[PDB]
Design a protein around this motif. Structure first.
Motif, PDB file in Angstrom:
ATOM      1  N   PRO A   1       0.821  -0.942  -0.002  1.00  0.00           N
ATOM      2  CA  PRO A   1       0.114   0.006   0.026  1.00  0.00           C
ATOM      3  C   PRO A   1       0.819   1.248  -0.239  1.00  0.00           C
ATOM      4  O   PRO A   1       2.193   1.033   0.310  1.00  0.00           O
ATOM      5  CB  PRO A   1      -0.996  -0.478   1.146  1.00  0.00           C
ATOM      6  CG  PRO A   1       0.503  -0.963   2.305  1.00  0.00           C
ATOM      7  CD  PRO A   1       1.606  -0.969   1.350  1.00  0.00           C
ATOM      8  N   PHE A   2       0.160   2.371  -0.845  1.00  0.00           N
ATOM      9  CA  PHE A   2       1.208   3.600  -0.576  1.00  0.00           C
ATOM     10  C   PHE A   2       0.357   4.406  -0.053  1.00  0.00           C
ATOM     11  O   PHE A   2      -1.108   4.036   0.853  1.00  0.00           O
ATOM     12  CB  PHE A   2       0.836   4.498  -2.080  1.00  0.00           C
ATOM     13  CG  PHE A   2       2.060   3.177  -3.219  1.00  0.00           C
ATOM     14  CD1 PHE A   2       1.823   2.748  -3.875  1.00  0.00           C
ATOM     15  CD2 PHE A   2       3.446   3.462  -3.009  1.00  0.00           C
ATOM     16  CE1 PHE A   2       2.915   1.715  -4.347  1.00  0.00           C
ATOM     17  CE2 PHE A   2       4.562   2.694  -3.813  1.00  0.00           C
ATOM     18  CZ  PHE A   2       4.462   2.512  -4.406  1.00  0.00           C
ATOM     19  N   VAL A   3       0.481   5.004   1.453  1.00  0.00           N
ATOM     20  CA  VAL A   3       0.501   6.433   1.690  1.00  0.00           C
ATOM     21  C   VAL A   3      -0.037   7.427   0.697  1.00  0.00           C
ATOM     22  O   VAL A   3       1.464   8.826   0.429  1.00  0.00           O
ATOM     23  CB  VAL A   3       1.106   6.684   2.988  1.00  0.00           C
ATOM     24  CG1 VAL A   3       0.888   7.904   3.593  1.00  0.00           C
ATOM     25  CG2 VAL A   3       1.097   5.883   4.268  1.00  0.00           C
ATOM     26  N   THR A   4      -1.401   8.145   0.073  1.00  0.00           N
ATOM     27  CA  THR A   4      -1.301   9.268  -0.027  1.00  0.00           C
ATOM     28  C   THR A   4      -2.747  10.011   0.760  1.00  0.00           C
ATOM     29  O   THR A   4      -3.674   9.406   1.602  1.00  0.00           O
ATOM     30  CB  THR A   4      -2.150   8.932  -1.491  1.00  0.00           C
ATOM     31  OG1 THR A   4      -0.812   8.129  -1.909  1.00  0.00           O
ATOM     32  CG2 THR A   4      -1.502  10.473  -2.226  1.00  0.00           C
ATOM     33  N   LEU A   5      -2.521  11.265   0.948  1.00  0.00           N
ATOM     34  CA  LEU A   5      -3.582  12.071   1.085  1.00  0.00           C
ATOM     35  C   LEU A   5      -4.286  13.324   0.498  1.00  0.00           C
ATOM     36  O   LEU A   5      -3.813  13.437  -0.686  1.00  0.00           O
ATOM     37  CB  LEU A   5      -3.025  13.510   2.293  1.00  0.00           C
ATOM     38  CG  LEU A   5      -1.985  12.242   3.259  1.00  0.00           C
ATOM     39  CD1 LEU A   5      -0.555  13.337   2.868  1.00  0.00           C
ATOM     40  CD2 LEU A   5      -2.013  12.076   4.689  1.00  0.00           C
ATOM     41  N   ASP A   6      -5.343  13.468   1.042  1.00  0.00           N
ATOM     42  CA  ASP A   6      -6.616  14.303  -0.174  1.00  0.00           C
ATOM     43  C   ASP A   6      -7.137  13.869  -0.890  1.00  0.00           C
ATOM     44  O   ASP A   6      -6.432  14.203  -2.084  1.00  0.00           O
ATOM     45  CB  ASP A   6      -5.725  15.867  -0.451  1.00  0.00           C
ATOM     46  CG  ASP A   6      -5.197  16.470   0.925  1.00  0.00           C
ATOM     47  OD1 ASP A   6      -3.979  16.986   1.088  1.00  0.00           O
ATOM     48  OD2 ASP A   6      -6.028  16.578   2.227  1.00  0.00           O
ATOM     49  N   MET A   7      -7.684  12.287  -0.219  1.00  0.00           N
ATOM     50  CA  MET A   7      -7.830  11.365  -1.782  1.00  0.00           C
ATOM     51  C   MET A   7      -8.787  11.566  -2.523  1.00  0.00           C
ATOM     52  O   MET A   7      -9.553  11.297  -3.461  1.00  0.00           O
ATOM     53  CB  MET A   7      -6.990  10.705  -1.433  1.00  0.00           C
ATOM     54  CG  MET A   7      -6.267   9.601  -1.788  1.00  0.00           C
ATOM     55  SD  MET A   7      -5.952   7.380  -1.640  1.00  0.00           S
ATOM     56  CE  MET A   7      -6.673   7.073  -0.928  1.00  0.00           C
ATOM     57  N   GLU A   8     -10.094  12.384  -1.760  1.00  0.00           N
ATOM     58  CA  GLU A   8     -11.012  11.795  -2.153  1.00  0.00           C
ATOM     59  C   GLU A   8     -11.647  13.403  -2.941  1.00  0.00           C
ATOM     60  O   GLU A   8     -12.785  13.734  -3.967  1.00  0.00           O
ATOM     61  CB  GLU A   8     -12.422  11.819  -1.485  1.00  0.00           C
ATOM     62  CG  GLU A   8     -13.595  12.017  -1.267  1.00  0.00           C
ATOM     63  CD  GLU A   8     -13.761  10.588  -2.723  1.00  0.00           C
ATOM     64  OE1 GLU A   8     -15.092   9.540  -2.408  1.00  0.00           O
ATOM     65  OE2 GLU A   8     -14.158  10.305  -3.890  1.00  0.00           O
ATOM     66  N   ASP A   9     -10.556  14.331  -2.726  1.00  0.00           N
ATOM     67  CA  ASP A   9     -10.697  15.842  -2.921  1.00  0.00           C
ATOM     68  C   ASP A   9      -9.843  15.984  -4.361  1.00  0.00           C
ATOM     69  O   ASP A   9      -9.727  17.151  -5.298  1.00  0.00           O
ATOM     70  CB  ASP A   9     -10.472  16.978  -2.175  1.00  0.00           C
ATOM     71  CG  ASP A   9      -9.113  16.765  -1.920  1.00  0.00           C
ATOM     72  OD1 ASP A   9      -8.599  17.227  -2.578  1.00  0.00           O
ATOM     73  OD2 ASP A   9      -8.261  17.854  -0.961  1.00  0.00           O
ATOM     74  N   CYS A  10      -9.745  14.733  -4.575  1.00  0.00           N
ATOM     75  CA  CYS A  10      -8.861  15.018  -6.437  1.00  0.00           C
ATOM     76  C   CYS A  10     -10.288  14.303  -7.174  1.00  0.00           C
ATOM     77  O   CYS A  10     -10.464  14.572  -8.296  1.00  0.00           O
ATOM     78  CB  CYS A  10      -8.209  13.327  -6.800  1.00  0.00           C
ATOM     79  SG  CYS A  10      -6.313  13.785  -5.507  1.00  0.00           S
ATOM     80  N   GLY A  11     -11.555  13.837  -6.308  1.00  0.00           N
ATOM     81  CA  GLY A  11     -12.381  14.280  -7.590  1.00  0.00           C
ATOM     82  C   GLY A  11     -13.213  15.398  -7.764  1.00  0.00           C
ATOM     83  O   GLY A  11     -12.372  16.732  -7.769  1.00  0.00           O
ATOM     84  N   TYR A  12     -14.315  15.549  -8.168  1.00  0.00           N
ATOM     85  CA  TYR A  12     -14.502  16.406  -9.255  1.00  0.00           C
ATOM     86  C   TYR A  12     -16.368  16.870  -8.913  1.00  0.00           C
ATOM     87  O   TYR A  12     -17.040  15.944  -8.561  1.00  0.00           O
ATOM     88  CB  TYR A  12     -14.653  16.823 -11.028  1.00  0.00           C
ATOM     89  CG  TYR A  12     -14.993  18.096 -11.767  1.00  0.00           C
ATOM     90  CD1 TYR A  12     -14.893  19.340 -11.863  1.00  0.00           C
ATOM     91  CD2 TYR A  12     -15.904  17.363 -11.990  1.00  0.00           C
ATOM     92  CE1 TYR A  12     -16.171  20.015 -12.548  1.00  0.00           C
ATOM     93  CE2 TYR A  12     -17.228  18.116 -12.628  1.00  0.00           C
ATOM     94  CZ  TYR A  12     -16.732  19.370 -12.801  1.00  0.00           C
ATOM     95  OH  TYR A  12     -18.291  19.873 -13.643  1.00  0.00           O
ATOM     96  N   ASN A  13     -16.691  17.995  -9.256  1.00  0.00           N
ATOM     97  CA  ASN A  13     -17.862  19.146  -9.268  1.00  0.00           C
ATOM     98  C   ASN A  13     -18.716  20.135  -9.682  1.00  0.00           C
ATOM     99  CB  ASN A  13     -18.579  18.509  -8.196  1.00  0.00           C
ATOM    100  CG  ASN A  13     -17.880  17.940  -6.368  1.00  0.00           C
ATOM    101  OD1 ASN A  13     -16.821  16.836  -6.971  1.00  0.00           O
ATOM    102  ND2 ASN A  13     -17.310  18.105  -5.118  1.00  0.00           N
TER     103      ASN A  13
END
Ligand SMILES: CN(C(=O)CC[C@@H](C1CCCCC1)N1Cc2cc(Oc3ccccc3)ccc2N=C1N)C1CCCCC1
Ligand SMILES: CN(C(=O)CC[C@@H](C1CCCCC1)N1Cc2cc(Oc3ccccc3)ccc2N=C1N)C1CCCCC1
Lengths: 385, 385
Positions: free
Chosen positions: A373-385
């Motif tokens: 696994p890798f550690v990555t943050l602010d992941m769901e704000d990579c989305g778009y609306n």
């Protein structure tokens, strides 16, 4: 049993044998995870080997409704019905499903192709004409105890497929209801389907033989990012495309080639014996993992983004298309991504799993990989609306 | 003389009669300002009414070179030659020009269409396979005293064109070498061609029934902005598209309709007697003027962006496509923009002029317009690099 039930071309898609009506009419149907209608040729268009003859089936029922599907300067159009469908090299069951009988089309059917309809395995919300038209796979799960998932291994391997090498060099597997461990190595890593319309996923970081593209990661998924067996190319939004392009360009200076090649406006060509794979970088997409703050990466080679187009004079001249391109529709993970991997569309758990395919094209220096696994943050704000 | 020399469809493009070889072979050729090859059908593809038979012409010369032009899942491919070309309803002269004899194609020819080749009137730098292949119009200007400009009036008017209403309801004019004052009203306003490849121009501000979109104006021309008679739609980069979309959406609340309509994934439909034009806003593009700090605006109606698609049961149901859409190729000013105007491709002066067409579709409330001068600053940094 269902192993090896797919034929045809990375480039003209993958098709499964199906039956419609009673008695059963056999058709080749393209498997398409980027759409949600089941639609078959219903009239004698010159490019088709065969077509659905409603006259001949007792179980046909008219829904007295038409449907019209424009796409990019082309269209198809049809009349909506239901009938009884089976898949000979699939689970031993029969379902009544919607069928759009295609009666007019432009730039839909492909001349030389051997399939005659499309199976949309994605979600209602993109079903034409509207979400009430229940998609095949929903119907197959409502009416039976077949589990709510399918998986795909897209190969397209040995030497170039054709029309007796489209028939007789069978290019992959659709496992309906399940997962076969023989089709992959290592482990499945799973990314959540962000929403049930297309199979949307969030990509959180991109790398080229190691080097981040340090872009907002909102721009990897701008508009959306999707997994699509009906698409041949790796497709990338303008900003990511241009940005990826530039670093694929940089990584690749080792040897050199023209402007319009990168834009798919001309194709590329060298001698055989003489493919230069090394001067091309790996591509790595990180995707959102099942856990907060955790991602995994899939990694593909140029074997899969530099993909043979059908020879100059079937000689030793080797001619391929750069299989990456632009979009205003989002990121599209098509056959270039998919032929690297066994892909599990786990609809019950709302997730997509990826593992290293046991048939993928490679060598001895490199390989396709799935790693975490890798550690990555602010992941769901990579989305778009 | 050359007035009314074009037929066919906004939607299947505009075609001019040409002759190739000796004795002269007549073909219908699509007029395309978005490309730079002269290319004609050379073999009996089923969709074609006719095709170039090199056997029959004494002036044909082989260049022993092939050319291959991929586009979006389709292609054409051909062998390069030169021969003697004329245009019966054009200037009385004969030129030797390059011709790509098309020998294989996919998703190029259109079934039902009546044209059999393409005339690329844009610049060398986008000529396949490379800029050394001198484009027709260059050749026509090198070899004669015909002036270095052409103009276009694209109409497509009265009642829907077909195949004896494609032949017999002739939809516009190509004036080669000149400008005819009878084809427009008011005055020509002129925007500089930013570079001689496509007919690139810089758009500097956009408005919808009055309301600026207050976006960076680098984003109106992102990648590029071009004038293209081979394209039917008004096409707009993602950000501008989404942004235009939203305010076209807002301006339009008066009545209401579905999500996928705006994205060209389904088409729109009301009764006849009952087109609701008013609830739709005008669109206004400002373009760079010939002078520092000065722009002009062209203005189009929904008559031109809501454009009839061929009836449900040729009834009174009225069904149209939203003719605006997305791109990763830049802004594309296609027939929706062009049918509003007389367009002058002033290649000698490196500029494009626009005037209000004497045949454009309108009413009695509104109209298409060309107006200036306006004061606008930081105009060339609306460009992109
Ligand atoms: C050749 N095909 C495609 O290029 C499919 C494009 C692909 C889209 C999905 C959304 C993201 C961008 C890529 N699609 C859309 C799609 C459209 C469609 O409707 C028509 C109508 C007339 C002519 C062409 C397409 C039907 C199915 C679609 N499924 C996708 N994956 C097609 C070839 C037919 C098999 C599907 C892919
Ligand atoms: C149906 N046609 C188009 O959709 C043309 C698209 C248009 C592009 C120009 C650049 C900005 C984006 C719009 N083009 C490009 C173009 C491509 C082309 O090559 C092929 C090869 C195989 C299948 C289809 C196209 C040939 C001519 C082009 N000229 C443009 N305006 C075509 C229909 C043929 C007549 C040209 C428009």
């Amino acid at each position: 049993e269902m192993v090896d039930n797919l034929r045809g071309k990375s480039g003209q898609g993958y098709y499964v044998e199906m039956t419609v009506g009673s008695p059963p009419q056999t058709l080749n149907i393209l498997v398409d995870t980027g759409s949600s209608n089941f639609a078959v040729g219903a009239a004698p268009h010159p490019f088709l080997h065969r077509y659905y003859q409603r006259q001949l089936s007792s179980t046909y029922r008219d829904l007295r409704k038409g449907v019209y599907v424009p796409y990019t300067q082309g269209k198809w159009e049809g009349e909506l019905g239901t009938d009884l469908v089976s898949i000979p090299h699939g689970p031993q069951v029969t379902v009544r499903a919607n069928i759009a009988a295609i009666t007019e089309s432009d730039k839909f059917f492909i001349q030389g192709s051997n399939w005659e309809g499309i199976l949309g395995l994605a979600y209602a919300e993109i079903a034409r004409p509207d979400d009430s038209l229940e998609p095949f796979f929903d119907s197959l799960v409502k009416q039976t105890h077949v589990p709510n998932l399918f998986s795909l291994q897209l190969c397209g391997a040995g030497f170039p497929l054709q029309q007796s090498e489209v028939l007789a060099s069978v290019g992959g597997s659709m496992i309906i209801g399940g997962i076969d461990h023989s089709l992959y190595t290592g482990s499945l890593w799973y990314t959540p389907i962000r929403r049930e319309w297309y199979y949307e996923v969030i990509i959180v970081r991109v790398e080229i033989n190691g080097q981040d593209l340090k872009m907002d990661c909102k721009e990897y998924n701008y508009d959306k990012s999707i997994v699509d067996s009906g698409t041949t190319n790796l497709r990338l939004p303008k900003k990511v495309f241009e940005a990826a392009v530039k670093s694929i360009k940089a990584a690749s200076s080792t040897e050199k080639f023209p402007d319009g090649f990168w834009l798919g406006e001309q194709l590329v060509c060298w001698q055989a014996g003489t493919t230069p794979w090394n001067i091309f970088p790996v591509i790595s997409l990180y995707l959102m993992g099942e856990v907060t703050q955790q991602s995994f990466r899939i990694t593909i080679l140029p074997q899969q983004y530099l993909r043979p187009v059908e020879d100059v004079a079937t000689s030793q001249d080797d001619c391929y298309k750069f299989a990456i391109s632009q979009s205003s529709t989002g990121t599209v993970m098509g056959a270039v991504i998919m032929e690297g991997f066994y892909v599990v569309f786990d609809r019950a758990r709302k997730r997509i799993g990826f593992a290293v395919s046991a048939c993928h094209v490679h060598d001895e220096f490199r390989t396709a990989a799935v790693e975490g696994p890798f550690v990555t943050l602010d992941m769901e704000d990579c989305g778009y609306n």
